[PDB]
Amino acid sequence: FCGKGYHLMSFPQSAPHGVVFLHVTYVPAQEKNFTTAPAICHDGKAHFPREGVFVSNGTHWFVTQRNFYEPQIITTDNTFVSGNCDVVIGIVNNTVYDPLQPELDS
Amino acid sequence: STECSNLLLQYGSFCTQLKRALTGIAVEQDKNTQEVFAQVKQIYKTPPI
Amino acid sequence: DLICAQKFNGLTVLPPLLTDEMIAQYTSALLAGTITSGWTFGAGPALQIPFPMQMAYRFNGIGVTQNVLYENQKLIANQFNSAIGKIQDSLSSTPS
Amino acid sequence: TMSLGAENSVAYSNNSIAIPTNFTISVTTEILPVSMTKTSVDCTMYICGD
Ligand SMILES: *[C@@H]1O[C@H](CO)[C@@H](O[C@@H]2O[C@H](CO)[C@@H](O)[C@H](O)[C@H]2NC(C)=O)[C@H](O)[C@H]1NC(C)=O
Ligand SMILES: *[C@@H]1O[C@H](CO)[C@@H](O[C@@H]2O[C@H](CO)[C@@H](O)[C@H](O)[C@H]2NC(C)=O)[C@H](O)[C@H]1NC(C)=O
Ligand SMILES: *[C@@H]1O[C@H](CO)[C@@H](O[C@@H]2O[C@H](CO)[C@@H](O)[C@H](O)[C@H]2NC(C)=O)[C@H](O)[C@H]1NC(C)=O
Ligand SMILES: *[C@@H]1O[C@H](CO)[C@@H](O[C@@H]2O[C@H](CO)[C@@H](O)[C@H](O)[C@H]2NC(C)=O)[C@H](O)[C@H]1NC(C)=O
Ligand SMILES: *[C@@H]1O[C@H](CO)[C@@H](O)[C@H](O)[C@H]1NC(C)=O
């Protein structure tokens, strides 16, 4: 509706008998392949991304936002637990870090 | 009939107006089809599996 | 001989610029983009995503969590297939 | 015969995703007519003059 791409803002300009809209949009570029999984199986629990997607660069698993590659460690703060690992099709085994674990460990 | 066309010429540019309006409608229909369906410039194809 | 008489009376039908096969090809390209890439192809380059993950994204769009889609993936696929079959039957069985 | 566009086979698989690593801020133009020329016709003067 407001340009090709994800719309950010628009600027109106007067024209003879008309208006010209300068649509400022966000276009993704320089995409890269990653191995993806619907959920992460840890301790018999299924973890799902709160706002992002699970991606793998070949050896390690990360969670990143869908529209930009920003890999972050899979923790309990960016994932939520719903059910065990027996129901989700394509769930992969990976560790999920706990921020509280070094705190109570030390 | 040539005589009919000669008498028709007295009425002016009615024929040109009707042809121009029909031509505008005819190009408009193609523009409508382009607007509805030709919204991608890449012809994507499904995987064989 | 309706068409012949209409042609013979100085009225000519002009063919559409896009033929039915090309319009079908455009719809096929749109279907391939929306199935293999979701909504990414409409906003830029087509980025591949698995279709269950795409459906999970769409479920998040309407405010339902991803787990609901993943846990009930087979049920959702069966419901979708049944609905598509019902659509074909409904179109084939209704004149209006 | 007119070309609909360039063929682009998307590499769909059940376990691979494509994530953007960069972006382009694109500005595009959309031209929309808003008004026409406002015309008033004196019917008597047009048809009959004086
Ligand atoms: C995927 O990314 C991770 C993190 O960026 C990589 O892990 C690091 O790899 C470098 C060099 O290979 C090592 O020096 C680091 O010690 C690794 N970090 C950890 C926490 O182990 C990983 O190698 C990447 N995978 C591939 C296939 O490139
Ligand atoms: C992910 O981890 C689970 C649990 O460690 C694995 O499930 C076990 O698989 C072994 C070998 O097939 C069986 O002997 C066990 O009985 C399974 N345990 C349970 C609780 O299911 C699973 O195989 C792992 N998946 C992958 C891909 O490595
Ligand atoms: C992701 O990987 C796929 C294949 O693993 C790439 O698709 C190939 O792209 C090349 C060049 O565009 C083609 O010659 C091949 O025919 C493609 N293969 C298939 C199966 O389609 C894809 O380009 C990769 N994505 C990125 C961003 O590099
Ligand atoms: C993302 O893309 C931008 C351009 O769209 C890249 O910026 C360019 O960087 C090179 C080298 O650093 C410069 O020579 C160009 O002049 C830059 N272009 C602009 C418009 O500033 C940027 O490096 C890319 N980032 C990543 C991580 O790929
Ligand atoms: C993905 O498909 C490949 C082959 O098509 C198959 O080996 C694999 O088990 C599939 N994975 C999932 C999660 O469906």
CSV table of C-alpha atoms and ligand atoms in Angstrom, one decimal:
chain,number,residue,atom,x,y,z
A,1,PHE,CA,0.0,0.0,0.0
A,2,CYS,CA,2.8,2.4,0.8
A,3,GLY,CA,5.6,1.2,-1.4
A,4,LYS,CA,7.4,-2.0,-2.3
A,5,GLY,CA,9.0,-3.5,0.9
A,6,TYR,CA,8.3,-3.2,4.6
A,7,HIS,CA,7.0,0.4,4.9
A,8,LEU,CA,8.8,2.7,7.2
A,9,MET,CA,7.5,6.2,6.4
A,10,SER,CA,6.1,8.4,3.6
A,11,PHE,CA,6.6,12.0,2.6
A,12,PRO,CA,3.9,14.0,0.7
A,13,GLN,CA,4.9,16.4,-2.1
A,14,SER,CA,2.5,18.7,-4.0
A,15,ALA,CA,2.2,18.3,-7.7
A,16,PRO,CA,0.0,20.0,-10.4
A,17,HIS,CA,-3.5,18.5,-9.9
A,18,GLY,CA,-2.0,15.7,-7.7
A,19,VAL,CA,0.1,14.4,-4.9
A,20,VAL,CA,3.4,12.5,-5.1
A,21,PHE,CA,4.2,10.2,-2.1
A,22,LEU,CA,7.8,9.3,-1.5
A,23,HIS,CA,7.6,6.0,0.3
A,24,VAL,CA,10.6,5.1,2.4
A,25,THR,CA,10.6,1.4,2.9
A,26,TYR,CA,12.9,-1.3,4.3
A,27,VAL,CA,14.0,-3.9,1.8
A,28,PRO,CA,15.9,-7.0,3.1
A,29,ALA,CA,19.2,-7.8,1.4
A,30,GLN,CA,22.2,-10.1,1.4
A,31,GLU,CA,20.3,-13.1,2.7
A,32,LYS,CA,22.1,-16.1,4.0
A,33,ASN,CA,21.1,-19.8,4.3
A,34,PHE,CA,20.8,-21.3,7.7
A,35,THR,CA,19.6,-24.7,9.0
A,36,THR,CA,16.3,-24.2,10.9
A,37,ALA,CA,14.3,-26.1,13.5
A,38,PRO,CA,10.8,-25.5,14.9
A,39,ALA,CA,11.8,-26.1,18.5
A,40,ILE,CA,14.8,-27.0,20.7
A,41,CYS,CA,14.7,-30.1,22.9
A,42,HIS,CA,16.3,-29.6,26.3
A,43,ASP,CA,15.9,-31.7,29.4
A,44,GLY,CA,12.8,-33.4,27.9
A,45,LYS,CA,11.1,-30.0,27.3
A,46,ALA,CA,10.4,-28.2,24.0
A,47,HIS,CA,11.6,-24.6,23.7
A,48,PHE,CA,10.0,-22.3,21.2
A,49,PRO,CA,11.3,-18.8,20.2
A,50,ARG,CA,9.5,-16.0,22.0
A,51,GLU,CA,9.9,-13.5,19.1
A,52,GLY,CA,12.5,-15.0,16.7
A,53,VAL,CA,13.6,-18.1,14.9
A,54,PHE,CA,16.1,-20.8,15.5
A,55,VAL,CA,19.0,-20.8,13.1
A,56,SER,CA,22.1,-22.9,12.7
A,57,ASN,CA,25.4,-22.0,10.9
A,58,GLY,CA,26.4,-25.6,10.8
A,59,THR,CA,27.6,-26.5,14.3
A,60,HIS,CA,25.9,-24.2,16.8
A,61,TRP,CA,22.3,-23.1,17.3
A,62,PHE,CA,21.1,-19.6,17.9
A,63,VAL,CA,17.9,-17.6,18.0
A,64,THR,CA,17.6,-14.5,15.8
A,65,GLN,CA,15.0,-12.0,14.8
A,66,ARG,CA,13.1,-13.0,11.6
A,67,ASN,CA,13.9,-9.9,9.5
A,68,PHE,CA,17.6,-9.4,10.3
A,69,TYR,CA,20.4,-11.8,11.1
A,70,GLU,CA,21.4,-11.1,14.8
A,71,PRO,CA,22.4,-14.5,16.3
A,72,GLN,CA,22.0,-14.7,20.1
A,73,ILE,CA,22.5,-17.6,22.5
A,74,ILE,CA,19.4,-19.7,23.1
A,75,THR,CA,18.4,-19.0,26.8
A,76,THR,CA,15.3,-19.3,28.9
A,77,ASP,CA,14.7,-15.5,28.4
A,78,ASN,CA,14.1,-15.6,24.7
A,79,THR,CA,12.3,-19.0,24.6
A,80,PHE,CA,9.2,-20.4,26.2
A,81,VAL,CA,8.5,-24.0,27.2
A,82,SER,CA,5.3,-25.8,26.0
A,83,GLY,CA,5.2,-29.6,26.3
A,84,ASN,CA,7.7,-32.3,25.8
A,85,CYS,CA,9.8,-33.2,22.8
A,86,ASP,CA,7.6,-36.1,21.6
A,87,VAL,CA,4.9,-34.0,19.8
A,88,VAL,CA,6.8,-31.4,17.7
A,89,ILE,CA,7.9,-32.7,14.2
A,90,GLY,CA,11.5,-31.8,13.4
A,91,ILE,CA,12.6,-30.8,17.0
A,92,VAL,CA,16.4,-30.9,17.4
A,93,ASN,CA,18.5,-31.6,20.4
A,94,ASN,CA,20.5,-28.6,21.7
A,95,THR,CA,21.4,-27.1,25.1
A,96,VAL,CA,19.5,-24.1,26.5
A,97,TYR,CA,21.5,-21.8,28.7
A,98,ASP,CA,20.2,-20.6,32.1
A,99,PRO,CA,21.3,-17.2,33.3
A,100,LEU,CA,20.4,-18.1,36.9
A,101,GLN,CA,22.7,-21.2,36.8
A,102,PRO,CA,26.1,-19.5,37.3
A,103,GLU,CA,24.4,-17.3,40.0
A,104,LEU,CA,23.2,-20.1,42.2
A,105,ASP,CA,26.2,-22.3,41.2
A,106,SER,CA,28.6,-19.8,42.6
B,1,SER,CA,-22.4,3.8,-48.3
B,2,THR,CA,-20.2,6.7,-49.3
B,3,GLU,CA,-23.1,9.2,-49.3
B,4,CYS,CA,-24.0,8.2,-45.7
B,5,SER,CA,-20.3,8.8,-44.6
B,6,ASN,CA,-20.5,12.2,-46.4
B,7,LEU,CA,-23.6,13.1,-44.4
B,8,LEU,CA,-22.0,11.7,-41.3
B,9,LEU,CA,-19.0,14.1,-41.6
B,10,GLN,CA,-21.4,17.1,-40.9
B,11,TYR,CA,-21.7,15.9,-37.3
B,12,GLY,CA,-18.1,16.4,-36.5
B,13,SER,CA,-15.7,14.4,-34.2
B,14,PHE,CA,-18.4,12.1,-32.6
B,15,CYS,CA,-16.7,9.1,-34.3
B,16,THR,CA,-13.3,10.1,-33.0
B,17,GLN,CA,-14.7,10.6,-29.5
B,18,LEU,CA,-16.3,7.1,-29.5
B,19,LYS,CA,-13.2,5.4,-30.8
B,20,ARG,CA,-11.0,7.2,-28.3
B,21,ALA,CA,-13.3,6.3,-25.4
B,22,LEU,CA,-13.4,2.6,-26.5
B,23,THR,CA,-9.6,2.6,-26.9
B,24,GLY,CA,-9.2,4.0,-23.4
B,25,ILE,CA,-11.4,1.2,-22.0
B,26,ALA,CA,-9.5,-1.4,-24.0
B,27,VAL,CA,-6.1,-0.2,-22.6
B,28,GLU,CA,-7.7,0.1,-19.2
B,29,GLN,CA,-8.7,-3.6,-19.1
B,30,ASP,CA,-5.1,-4.6,-19.9
B,31,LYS,CA,-3.9,-2.2,-17.2
B,32,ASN,CA,-6.3,-3.8,-14.7
B,33,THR,CA,-5.0,-7.3,-15.5
B,34,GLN,CA,-1.4,-6.0,-15.1
B,35,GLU,CA,-2.2,-4.4,-11.8
B,36,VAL,CA,-4.0,-7.5,-10.4
B,37,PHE,CA,-1.7,-10.3,-11.6
B,38,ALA,CA,1.6,-8.8,-12.7
B,39,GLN,CA,2.7,-7.9,-9.2
B,40,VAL,CA,5.9,-10.0,-9.2
B,41,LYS,CA,8.9,-9.6,-11.5
B,42,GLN,CA,10.3,-13.0,-10.7
B,43,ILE,CA,8.5,-16.2,-11.9
B,44,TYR,CA,8.8,-18.5,-8.9
B,45,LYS,CA,8.6,-22.2,-9.2
B,46,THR,CA,7.7,-24.9,-6.7
B,47,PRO,CA,10.3,-27.6,-5.8
B,48,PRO,CA,9.9,-30.9,-7.5
B,49,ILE,CA,9.1,-32.7,-4.2
C,1,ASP,CA,-23.9,-17.2,-35.4
C,2,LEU,CA,-24.0,-14.4,-32.8
C,3,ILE,CA,-20.3,-13.7,-32.9
C,4,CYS,CA,-20.2,-13.7,-36.7
C,5,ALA,CA,-23.0,-11.2,-37.0
C,6,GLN,CA,-21.4,-8.9,-34.3
C,7,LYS,CA,-18.1,-9.0,-36.2
C,8,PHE,CA,-19.9,-8.3,-39.5
C,9,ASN,CA,-21.6,-5.2,-38.1
C,10,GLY,CA,-18.3,-3.4,-37.5
C,11,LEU,CA,-17.9,-4.4,-33.8
C,12,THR,CA,-14.6,-6.2,-33.1
C,13,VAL,CA,-13.6,-8.0,-29.9
C,14,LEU,CA,-9.9,-7.4,-29.1
C,15,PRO,CA,-7.9,-10.2,-27.4
C,16,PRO,CA,-6.6,-9.6,-23.9
C,17,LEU,CA,-2.9,-8.7,-23.8
C,18,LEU,CA,-2.2,-11.4,-21.2
C,19,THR,CA,-3.4,-14.8,-22.4
C,20,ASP,CA,-5.1,-17.3,-20.0
C,21,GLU,CA,-1.9,-19.4,-19.9
C,22,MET,CA,0.2,-16.4,-18.9
C,23,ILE,CA,-2.3,-15.3,-16.3
C,24,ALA,CA,-2.2,-18.9,-15.0
C,25,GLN,CA,1.6,-18.6,-15.0
C,26,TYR,CA,1.4,-15.4,-12.9
C,27,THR,CA,-0.9,-17.1,-10.4
C,28,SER,CA,1.5,-20.1,-10.3
C,29,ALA,CA,4.4,-17.7,-9.6
C,30,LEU,CA,2.4,-16.0,-6.8
C,31,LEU,CA,1.5,-19.4,-5.3
C,32,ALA,CA,5.1,-20.6,-5.4
C,33,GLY,CA,6.2,-17.4,-3.8
C,34,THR,CA,3.6,-17.5,-1.0
C,35,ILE,CA,4.2,-21.2,-0.4
C,36,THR,CA,8.0,-21.5,-0.5
C,37,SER,CA,8.8,-18.0,0.8
C,38,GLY,CA,5.7,-16.8,2.8
C,39,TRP,CA,5.4,-13.0,2.6
C,40,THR,CA,9.1,-12.3,2.1
C,41,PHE,CA,8.9,-12.4,-1.7
C,42,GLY,CA,6.3,-9.6,-1.7
C,43,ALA,CA,8.5,-7.2,0.3
C,44,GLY,CA,11.8,-8.0,-1.4
C,45,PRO,CA,13.9,-11.1,-2.3
C,46,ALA,CA,12.2,-14.4,-1.8
C,47,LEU,CA,13.6,-16.0,1.4
C,48,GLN,CA,12.9,-19.7,1.7
C,49,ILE,CA,11.3,-20.9,4.9
C,50,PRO,CA,9.7,-24.3,5.7
C,51,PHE,CA,5.9,-24.1,5.4
C,52,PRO,CA,5.2,-25.2,9.0
C,53,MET,CA,7.4,-22.4,10.2
C,54,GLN,CA,5.6,-20.0,7.9
C,55,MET,CA,2.2,-21.2,9.2
C,56,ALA,CA,3.6,-20.7,12.8
C,57,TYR,CA,4.5,-17.1,11.8
C,58,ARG,CA,1.0,-16.6,10.5
C,59,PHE,CA,-0.4,-18.0,13.7
C,60,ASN,CA,1.7,-15.5,15.7
C,61,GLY,CA,0.3,-12.8,13.4
C,62,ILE,CA,-3.2,-13.5,14.6
C,63,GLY,CA,-2.1,-13.8,18.2
C,64,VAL,CA,-1.7,-17.6,18.7
C,65,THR,CA,1.6,-19.0,19.9
C,66,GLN,CA,3.8,-21.2,17.7
C,67,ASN,CA,3.4,-24.2,20.0
C,68,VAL,CA,-0.3,-24.5,19.1
C,69,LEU,CA,0.6,-24.8,15.4
C,70,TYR,CA,3.5,-27.2,16.0
C,71,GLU,CA,1.7,-29.5,18.4
C,72,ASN,CA,-1.4,-29.7,16.2
C,73,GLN,CA,0.4,-29.7,12.8
C,74,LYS,CA,-1.1,-32.9,11.5
C,75,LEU,CA,-4.6,-31.8,12.5
C,76,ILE,CA,-4.2,-28.4,10.9
C,77,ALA,CA,-2.9,-30.0,7.7
C,78,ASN,CA,-5.8,-32.4,7.6
C,79,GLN,CA,-8.3,-29.6,8.2
C,80,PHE,CA,-6.7,-27.5,5.4
C,81,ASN,CA,-6.8,-30.4,3.0
C,82,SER,CA,-10.4,-31.1,3.9
C,83,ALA,CA,-11.3,-27.4,3.4
C,84,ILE,CA,-9.6,-27.3,0.0
C,85,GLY,CA,-11.5,-30.4,-1.1
C,86,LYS,CA,-14.7,-28.9,0.2
C,87,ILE,CA,-14.0,-25.7,-1.8
C,88,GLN,CA,-13.5,-27.7,-5.0
C,89,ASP,CA,-16.7,-29.7,-4.4
C,90,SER,CA,-18.6,-26.6,-3.6
C,91,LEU,CA,-17.5,-24.8,-6.8
C,92,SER,CA,-18.3,-28.0,-8.8
C,93,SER,CA,-21.7,-28.5,-7.3
C,94,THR,CA,-23.1,-24.9,-7.3
C,95,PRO,CA,-24.1,-23.2,-10.6
C,96,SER,CA,-24.3,-19.8,-9.0
D,1,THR,CA,5.9,-13.4,-27.1
D,2,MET,CA,6.2,-11.2,-24.0
D,3,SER,CA,8.3,-12.5,-21.1
D,4,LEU,CA,6.4,-12.5,-17.8
D,5,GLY,CA,9.6,-12.2,-15.8
D,6,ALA,CA,12.9,-13.9,-14.9
D,7,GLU,CA,12.6,-17.5,-13.6
D,8,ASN,CA,13.6,-17.8,-9.9
D,9,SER,CA,13.4,-21.3,-8.4
D,10,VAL,CA,13.4,-20.8,-4.7
D,11,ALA,CA,15.5,-23.4,-2.9
D,12,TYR,CA,12.7,-24.7,-0.7
D,13,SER,CA,13.5,-27.5,1.8
D,14,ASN,CA,11.9,-28.6,5.0
D,15,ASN,CA,14.8,-27.6,7.3
D,16,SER,CA,16.5,-24.5,5.7
D,17,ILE,CA,15.6,-20.9,6.2
D,18,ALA,CA,17.0,-17.7,4.6
D,19,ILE,CA,17.7,-14.8,7.0
D,20,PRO,CA,18.6,-11.3,5.7
D,21,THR,CA,21.9,-10.1,6.9
D,22,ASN,CA,21.6,-6.5,5.6
D,23,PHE,CA,19.0,-4.0,4.3
D,24,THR,CA,18.4,-1.3,1.8
D,25,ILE,CA,16.4,1.8,2.6
D,26,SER,CA,14.5,2.2,-0.7
D,27,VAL,CA,12.5,5.4,-1.5
D,28,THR,CA,9.9,5.0,-4.3
D,29,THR,CA,7.5,7.4,-5.9
D,30,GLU,CA,3.7,7.1,-6.2
D,31,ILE,CA,1.9,9.7,-8.3
D,32,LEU,CA,-1.8,10.1,-7.6
D,33,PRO,CA,-4.1,12.6,-9.4
D,34,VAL,CA,-6.2,14.6,-6.9
D,35,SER,CA,-8.2,17.2,-8.8
D,36,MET,CA,-9.2,18.1,-12.3
D,37,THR,CA,-9.6,21.4,-14.2
D,38,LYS,CA,-12.8,23.1,-12.9
D,39,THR,CA,-14.9,24.0,-15.9
D,40,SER,CA,-18.1,26.1,-16.0
D,41,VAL,CA,-20.1,26.3,-19.2
D,42,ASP,CA,-22.7,29.0,-20.1
D,43,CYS,CA,-25.2,26.8,-21.8
D,44,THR,CA,-27.0,29.7,-23.6
D,45,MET,CA,-23.8,31.4,-24.7
D,46,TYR,CA,-22.3,28.1,-25.9
D,47,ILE,CA,-25.3,26.9,-27.9
D,48,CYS,CA,-26.6,30.3,-29.1
D,49,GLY,CA,-23.9,33.0,-28.6
D,50,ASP,CA,-25.6,36.4,-28.8
E,1,LIG,C1,28.9,-20.8,14.2
E,1,LIG,O1,29.0,-19.7,15.0
E,1,LIG,C2,29.7,-19.9,16.3
E,1,LIG,C3,29.7,-18.6,17.0
E,1,LIG,O2,29.9,-17.5,16.1
E,1,LIG,C4,31.1,-20.5,16.0
E,1,LIG,O3,31.7,-20.8,17.3
E,1,LIG,C5,33.0,-20.3,17.4
E,1,LIG,O4,33.9,-20.6,16.4
E,1,LIG,C6,35.1,-20.0,16.5
E,1,LIG,C7,35.9,-20.3,15.3
E,1,LIG,O5,35.4,-21.4,14.6
E,1,LIG,C8,35.8,-20.5,17.8
E,1,LIG,O6,37.1,-19.8,18.0
E,1,LIG,C9,34.9,-20.2,19.0
E,1,LIG,O7,35.5,-20.8,20.2
E,1,LIG,C10,33.5,-20.8,18.8
E,1,LIG,N1,32.7,-20.5,19.9
E,1,LIG,C11,32.2,-21.4,20.7
E,1,LIG,C12,31.3,-20.8,21.8
E,1,LIG,O8,32.5,-22.6,20.7
E,1,LIG,C13,31.0,-21.7,15.1
E,1,LIG,O9,32.3,-22.2,14.8
E,1,LIG,C14,30.3,-21.4,13.8
E,1,LIG,N2,30.1,-22.6,13.0
E,1,LIG,C15,30.7,-22.7,11.8
E,1,LIG,C16,30.4,-24.0,11.1
E,1,LIG,O10,31.3,-21.7,11.3
E,2,LIG,C1,17.5,-36.3,21.4
E,2,LIG,O1,17.7,-36.7,22.8
E,2,LIG,C2,16.8,-37.8,23.2
E,2,LIG,C3,17.0,-38.0,24.6
E,2,LIG,O2,18.4,-38.0,25.0
E,2,LIG,C4,17.0,-39.0,22.3
E,2,LIG,O3,16.0,-40.0,22.6
E,2,LIG,C5,16.7,-41.2,23.0
E,2,LIG,O4,17.2,-41.9,21.8
E,2,LIG,C6,17.9,-43.1,22.1
E,2,LIG,C7,18.6,-43.6,20.8
E,2,LIG,O5,17.6,-43.6,19.8
E,2,LIG,C8,17.0,-44.1,22.8
E,2,LIG,O6,17.7,-45.3,23.1
E,2,LIG,C9,16.3,-43.5,24.0
E,2,LIG,O7,15.3,-44.4,24.5
E,2,LIG,C10,15.7,-42.1,23.7
E,2,LIG,N1,15.2,-41.5,24.9
E,2,LIG,C11,14.0,-40.8,24.9
E,2,LIG,C12,13.7,-40.2,26.2
E,2,LIG,O8,13.3,-40.7,23.9
E,2,LIG,C13,16.9,-38.7,20.8
E,2,LIG,O9,17.3,-39.8,20.1
E,2,LIG,C14,17.8,-37.5,20.5
E,2,LIG,N2,17.7,-37.1,19.1
E,2,LIG,C15,18.7,-36.8,18.3
E,2,LIG,C16,18.3,-36.5,16.9
E,2,LIG,O10,19.9,-36.9,18.7
E,3,LIG,C1,20.9,-21.7,-0.3
E,3,LIG,O1,21.3,-23.0,-0.7
E,3,LIG,C2,20.6,-23.4,-1.9
E,3,LIG,C3,21.0,-24.8,-2.2
E,3,LIG,O2,21.6,-25.4,-1.1
E,3,LIG,C4,21.0,-22.4,-3.1
E,3,LIG,O3,20.2,-22.7,-4.2
E,3,LIG,C5,21.1,-22.9,-5.4
E,3,LIG,O4,21.5,-21.6,-6.0
E,3,LIG,C6,22.4,-21.7,-7.1
E,3,LIG,C7,22.8,-20.4,-7.5
E,3,LIG,O5,21.7,-19.4,-7.3
E,3,LIG,C8,21.7,-22.5,-8.2
E,3,LIG,O6,22.6,-22.7,-9.3
E,3,LIG,C9,21.2,-23.9,-7.6
E,3,LIG,O7,20.5,-24.6,-8.6
E,3,LIG,C10,20.3,-23.7,-6.4
E,3,LIG,N1,19.9,-25.0,-5.8
E,3,LIG,C11,18.7,-25.3,-5.6
E,3,LIG,C12,18.4,-26.6,-5.0
E,3,LIG,O8,17.7,-24.5,-5.8
E,3,LIG,C13,20.7,-21.0,-2.6
E,3,LIG,O9,21.2,-20.0,-3.6
E,3,LIG,C14,21.3,-20.7,-1.2
E,3,LIG,N2,21.0,-19.3,-0.8
E,3,LIG,C15,21.9,-18.4,-0.7
E,3,LIG,C16,21.4,-17.1,-0.2
E,3,LIG,O10,23.1,-18.5,-0.9
E,4,LIG,C1,25.4,-3.7,4.4
E,4,LIG,O1,25.2,-3.0,3.1
E,4,LIG,C2,25.8,-1.7,3.1
E,4,LIG,C3,25.4,-1.0,1.8
E,4,LIG,O2,24.1,-1.3,1.5
E,4,LIG,C4,27.3,-1.9,3.3
E,4,LIG,O3,27.9,-0.6,3.3
E,4,LIG,C5,29.0,-0.5,2.4
E,4,LIG,O4,30.3,-0.9,2.9
E,4,LIG,C6,31.4,-0.9,2.0
E,4,LIG,C7,32.6,-1.5,2.7
E,4,LIG,O5,32.4,-1.4,4.2
E,4,LIG,C8,31.6,0.5,1.5
E,4,LIG,O6,32.6,0.5,0.5
E,4,LIG,C9,30.3,1.0,0.9
E,4,LIG,O7,30.5,2.4,0.5
E,4,LIG,C10,29.2,0.9,1.9
E,4,LIG,N1,27.9,1.4,1.3
E,4,LIG,C11,27.1,2.3,1.9
E,4,LIG,C12,25.9,2.7,1.1
E,4,LIG,O8,27.4,2.8,3.0
E,4,LIG,C13,27.6,-2.6,4.6
E,4,LIG,O9,29.0,-2.9,4.7
E,4,LIG,C14,26.9,-3.9,4.6
E,4,LIG,N2,27.0,-4.6,5.9
E,4,LIG,C15,27.2,-5.9,6.0
E,4,LIG,C16,27.4,-6.4,7.4
E,4,LIG,O10,27.1,-6.7,5.0
E,5,LIG,C1,13.0,-33.4,5.5
E,5,LIG,O1,13.0,-34.1,4.2
E,5,LIG,C2,14.1,-35.0,4.1
E,5,LIG,C3,14.0,-35.5,2.7
E,5,LIG,O2,13.0,-34.9,2.0
E,5,LIG,C4,13.9,-36.1,5.2
E,5,LIG,O3,15.1,-36.9,5.1
E,5,LIG,C5,13.8,-35.5,6.6
E,5,LIG,O4,13.5,-36.5,7.5
E,5,LIG,C6,12.8,-34.4,6.6
E,5,LIG,N1,12.8,-33.7,7.9
E,5,LIG,C7,11.6,-33.3,8.5
E,5,LIG,C8,11.8,-32.6,9.8
E,5,LIG,O5,10.5,-33.5,8.0
